[PDB]
Amino acid sequence: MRALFYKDGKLFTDNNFLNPVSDNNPAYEVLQHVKIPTHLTDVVVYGQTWEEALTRLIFVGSDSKGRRQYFYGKMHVQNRNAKRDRIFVRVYNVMKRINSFINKNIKKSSTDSNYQLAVFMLMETMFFIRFGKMKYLKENETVGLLTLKNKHIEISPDKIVIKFVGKDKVSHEFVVHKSNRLYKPLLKLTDDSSPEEFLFNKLSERKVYESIKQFGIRIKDLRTYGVNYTFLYNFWTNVKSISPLPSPKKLIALTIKQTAEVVGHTPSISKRAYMATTILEMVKDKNFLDVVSKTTFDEFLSIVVDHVKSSTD
DNA sequence: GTGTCGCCCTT
DNA sequence: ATTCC
DNA sequence: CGGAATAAGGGCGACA
């Protein structure tokens, strides 16, 4: 669709606002259905009907820091939500490969990029930490996995504590005890003598992208997966543990709250942006609780994966 | 090859 | 993404 | 619970 330029209710083909579109351009219908936020500038509106806008990019504008902010139609958003079912199955199906890659590489020297990649994947599948692009470190002092420095790693004789300030200035602490798979290779990777150096000093964005590619997923998919995996573990444990069973509502709520606290974000975003939609609806089915009764977690996980498989298509 | 940018899209 | 409503 | 408002993340291919 053609990008039209918006000024004071009016649409133009050029960014200098010298060439107006016709009064019957279909994007004017779009403007009847959406509010252009007053805080955005340099607004671009796509030339399309409202029906076409439902599934597409509608408009873009610059916020006060000059960032381009994109607004999408409701069906685009719904189609986005629907993907999480598929992502959840896909990661489950590739986890054994990821663990095989970790185990193969985690015995190498700490200066070997393959070792570092192994430790990156292990930390990620254990803690679901965000990728950590350098750009937000520079722009906002934001730390994620790739931008961890030795300063963020605190070594005690019993434990290792990873603490850093991540997206939206939300502080995070993850603890790695002596008995953890991760403890030895993390202790090995960290350089106490160089607080300001990156932990993953032989990695880069490109090198991470190239390595994750072999598993058919992105790093953020490991986070989507971990949220669901964690919800399911908690759901199972809850059904199995709490003496008088809470109401349905109360149980889902408790499970989300627990899951969101492990992951480090709000219950609201956990459900809105991470939980697979089919998982959520199957957990409302009162016929489901009985299936849970006498499963192992893996049997339980395996039934959920199968139901999500046959319900995504 | 590297570090960054610019666009798109997501949380 | 958090916050607010 | 849900959703509006707006801030700031990730993914990917191209530029310097």
Side-chain angles (χ1 to χ4, degrees):
Chain A
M1 299 306 170
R2 151 135 80 166
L4 308 174
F5 298 84
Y6 174 92
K7 176 79 187 293
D8 195 14
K10 297 295 188 148
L11 292 174
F12 303 85
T13 74
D14 64 310
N15 67 351
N16 291 317
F17 317 123
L18 308 176
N19 193 64
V21 306
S22 316
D23 293 323
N24 67 4
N25 184 288
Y28 282 122
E29 177 196 62
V30 177
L31 294 173
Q32 286 179 86
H33 281 84
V34 283
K35 202 193 304 193
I36 306 297
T38 99
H39 80 270
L40 294 173
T41 57
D42 292 332
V43 177
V44 154
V45 172
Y46 288 87
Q48 72 202 335
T49 70
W50 179 243
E51 177 197 56
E52 294 174 324
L54 258 12
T55 63
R56 288 177 178 83
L57 180 55
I58 301 182
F59 70 90
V60 358
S62 295
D63 66 12
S64 67
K65 288 183 189 183
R67 306 132 151 162
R68 296 296 287 169
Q69 297 289 356
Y70 285 63
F71 187 95
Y72 293 87
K74 320 47 195 68
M75 204 54 30
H76 173 95
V77 170
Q78 157 171 337
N79 294 155
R80 180 200 296 144
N81 291 332
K83 293 178 176 173
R84 297 195 299 267
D85 283 346
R86 286 182 248 142
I87 292 160
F88 165 71
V89 176
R90 176 178 304 120
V91 183
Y92 174 91
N93 286 168
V94 79
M95 194 56 51
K96 259 86 289 316
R97 218 123 76 60
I98 297 175
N99 280 313
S100 158
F101 172 86
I102 292 165
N103 289 153
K104 171 154 161 158
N105 284 294
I106 200 97
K107 28 208 182 177
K108 288 164 170 182
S109 164
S110 66
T111 70
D112 185 321
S113 60
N114 286 319
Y115 175 87
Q116 296 197 7
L117 247 7
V119 173
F120 190 95
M121 293 310 162
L122 192 43
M123 290 182 65
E124 174 62 28
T125 52
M126 287 218 70
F127 301 122
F128 323 134
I129 295 163
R130 299 179 183 91
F131 182 101
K133 292 174 57 154
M134 291 281 339
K135 166 200 210 150
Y136 305 112
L137 211 218
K138 295 165 161 87
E139 250 152 55
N140 300 321
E141 299 175 349
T142 301
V143 174
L145 192 63
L146 219 214
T147 39
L148 250 13
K149 284 167 172 142
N150 295 300
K151 61 180 185 195
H152 299 297
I153 317 288
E154 262 288 63
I155 288 173
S156 283
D158 46 318
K159 52 174 154 173
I160 288 155
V161 186
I162 306 149
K163 68 182 298 185
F164 68 90
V165 177
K167 175 187 188 187
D168 282 316
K169 302 309 209 192
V170 184
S171 197
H172 304 281
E173 207 179 298
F174 306 97
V175 42
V176 191
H177 291 275
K178 180 66 175 144
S179 50
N180 195 300
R181 202 182 164 191
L182 216 204
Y183 182 90
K184 288 208 171 202
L186 184 55
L187 182 67
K188 206 168 85 171
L189 184 53
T190 314
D191 179 10
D192 289 344
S193 74
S194 298
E196 298 300 322
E197 292 301 307
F198 291 115
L199 184 61
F200 301 107
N201 66 342
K202 298 301 242 309
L203 300 186
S204 76
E205 301 187 349
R206 215 178 328 257
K207 281 163 181 167
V208 178
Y209 293 147
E210 276 311 302
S211 170
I212 200 63
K213 210 180 263 203
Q214 72 191 285
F215 305 113
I217 62 167
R218 298 82 48 82
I219 289 302
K220 72 182 288 291
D221 297 330
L222 298 174
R223 193 175 170 84
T224 299
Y225 181 71
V227 170
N228 288 275
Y229 180 93
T230 309
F231 173 103
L232 286 169
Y233 183 64
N234 285 125
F235 195 81
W236 183 82
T237 305
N238 292 342
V239 176
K240 297 257 182 173
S241 72
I242 55 218
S243 164
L245 274 133
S247 67
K249 270 139 185 155
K250 213 131 261 162
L251 194 43
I252 304 136
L254 179 60
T255 302
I256 300 301
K257 195 187 165 170
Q258 287 163 338
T259 300
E261 187 256 41
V262 171
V263 180
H265 55 195
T266 47
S268 68
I269 201 60
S270 205
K271 182 169 165 166
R272 184 194 317 159
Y274 292 89
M275 290 300 309
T277 57
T278 300
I279 282 179
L280 247 21
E281 66 175 80
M282 91 187 279
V283 128
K284 275 155 196 140
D285 189 343
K286 289 182 166 52
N287 294 315
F288 192 46
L289 273 70
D290 287 357
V291 197
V292 180
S293 269
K294 252 100 162 198
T295 48
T296 295
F297 178 69
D298 284 302
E299 291 175 342
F300 171 59
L301 171 57
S302 189
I303 285 153
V304 168
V305 165
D306 281 19
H307 179 73
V308 172
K309 256 209 225 294
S310 50
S311 272
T312 201
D313 248 301

